């Protein structure tokens, strides 16, 4: 298992990164510092997470300490839904760059295909509780992302939470200048994503798997929800390999040629989660884990189900 995957912009991306959604601002600086110290070279960020300044403190301190060089890091962020307008994209990117203490991003993603009305609120509501859309179509947002490449602010651009028809719309865009490098989607044994993964891979788009552990700290968790980390069937595979359940859940997407971004703010778990390059799941293990699919989503964007670009009505 090599540590990096080649993107269609010619750059290499580390297949293991550190997630930062829900990482508290008072803990994420140390989390990122520890991650870099124990070998992580890829950090997954977003403006909507409200902690990029604190992530950036860690990155800058490790660059200053010469623990790593900037060229060895792969920093990802995402354009939030209230910035899909062409006149807002550059400023949104530049705010993320300023907060992260960077001159460029390695990868910048459209966070969701759904654009929302600009303003201070990340989920602007009408008086009846619906999210207020933007009129800007995703192809125009894509053109604005392409401009960021041509201005030197980002090395690669991509998408997140796009269904296969939405990926295809980007690939079929009149005058397309840069293909998406990555589609970042939820993926784990309860949401295995065979169809969308094969489509993206067949087009040279690398897939990143988010919520690989089933996001046990998601805000809307209910006790009756299925739990990957507690599933006896997955625990049994881990025991057979003398690894933790989390380590199996991280290795699983790696063996599907995916990038994976487990989140932790716990130093011991950050280190544990990186120790996944020294064992192999068998083909039988892989097929067994795939068999657990139940189309269960951590992130359903449940307030956006009437948005014209809501991604999860389509089968895939
Ligand atoms: N593009 C998108 O729309 C999108 C959506 C969701 C997620 N993401 C990205 O993907 C990342 C990962 O997804 P996620 O944050 O939803 O969840 P996740 O990585 O599946 O799970 C994180 C949870 O697992 C715990 N954990 C981590 N390592 C563990 C271990 N070895 N043993 C036991 N528990 C462990 C963490 O606890 P502690 O932190 O307390 O250790 C935290 O509660 C996000 O942080 C974000 O960067 C992107």
Curated annotation (Swiss-Prot):
Gene3D superfamilies: NADP-dependent oxidoreductase domain
Site (Lowers pKa of active site Tyr): 78
Regulation: Cys-299 may regulate the kinetic and inhibition properties of the enzyme, but does not participate in catalysis. Tolrestat inhibits retinal reduction.
Quaternary structure (record): Monomer.
Residue sites binding NADP(+) per the record: 10-19, 211-273
Enzyme class: oxidoreductase
Organism: Homo sapiens (Human)
Single annotated GO MF: aldose reductase (NADPH) activity
InterPro entries in UniProt: AKR, Aldo/ket_reductase_CS, NADP_OxRdtase_dom, NADP_OxRdtase_dom_sf
Effect of residue 49 to F: Complete loss of glyceraldehyde oxidoreductase activity
Protein name: Aldo-keto reductase family 1 member B1
GO biological process, one term: doxorubicin metabolic process
N-acetylalanine: modified positions: 2
Keywords assigned: Acetylation, Cytoplasm, Lipid metabolism, NADP, Oxidoreductase, Phosphoprotein
Function text: Catalyzes the NADPH-dependent reduction of a wide variety of carbonyl-containing compounds to their corresponding alcohols. Displays enzymatic activity towards endogenous metabolites such as aromatic and aliphatic aldehydes, ketones, monosacharides, bile acids and xenobiotics substrates. Key enzyme in the polyol pathway, catalyzes reduction of glucose to sorbitol during hyperglycemia. Reduces steroids and their derivatives and prostaglandins. Displays low enzymatic activity toward all-trans-retinal, 9-cis-retinal, and 13-cis-retinal.
């Amino acid at each position: 298992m090599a540590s990096r995957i080649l993107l269609n912009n010619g750059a290499k991306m580390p297949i293991l990164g550190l997630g930062t959604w829900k990482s508290p601002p008072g803990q994420v600086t140390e989390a990122v510092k520890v991650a870099i110290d124990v070998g992580y070279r890829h950090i997954d960020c977003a403006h909507v997470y409200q902690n990029e300044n604190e992530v950036g403190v860690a990155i800058q301190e490790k660059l200053r300490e010469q623990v790593v060089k900037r060229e060895e890091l792969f920093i990802v962020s995402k354009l939030w839904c209230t910035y899909h307008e062409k006149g807002l994209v550059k400023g949104a990117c530049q705010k993320t760059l300023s907060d992260l203490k960077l001159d460029y991003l390695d990868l910048y993603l459209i966070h969701w295909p759904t654009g929302f009305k600009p303003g201070k609120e990340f989920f602007p509501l009408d008086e009846s509780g619906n999210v207020v859309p933007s009129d800007t179509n995703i192809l125009d947002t894509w053109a604005a992302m392409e401009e960021l490449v041509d201005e030197g602010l980002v090395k690669a651009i991509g998408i997140s939470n796009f269904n296969h028809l939405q990926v295809e719309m980007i690939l079929n865009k009149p005058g397309l200048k840069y293909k998406p490098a990555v589609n970042q989607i939820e993926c784990h044994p309860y949401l295995t994503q065979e169809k969308l993964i094969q489509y993206c891979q067949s087009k040279g788009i690398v897939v990143t798997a988010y919520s690989p552990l089933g996001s046990p700290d998601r805000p809307w968790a209910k006790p009756e929800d299925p739990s990957l980390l507690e599933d006896p069937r997955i625990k049994a595979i881990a025991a057979k390999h003398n690894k933790t359940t989390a380590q199996v859940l991280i290795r699983f997407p790696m063996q599907r040629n995916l990038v994976v971004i487990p989140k932790s703010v716990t130093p011991e778990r950050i280190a544990e989660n990186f120790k996944v390059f020294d064992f192999e799941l068998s083909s039988q293990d892989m097929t067994t884990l795939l068999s657990y699919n139940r189309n269960w989503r951590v992130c359903g964007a449940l307030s956006c189900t009437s948005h014209k670009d809501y991604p999860f009505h389509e089968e895939f």
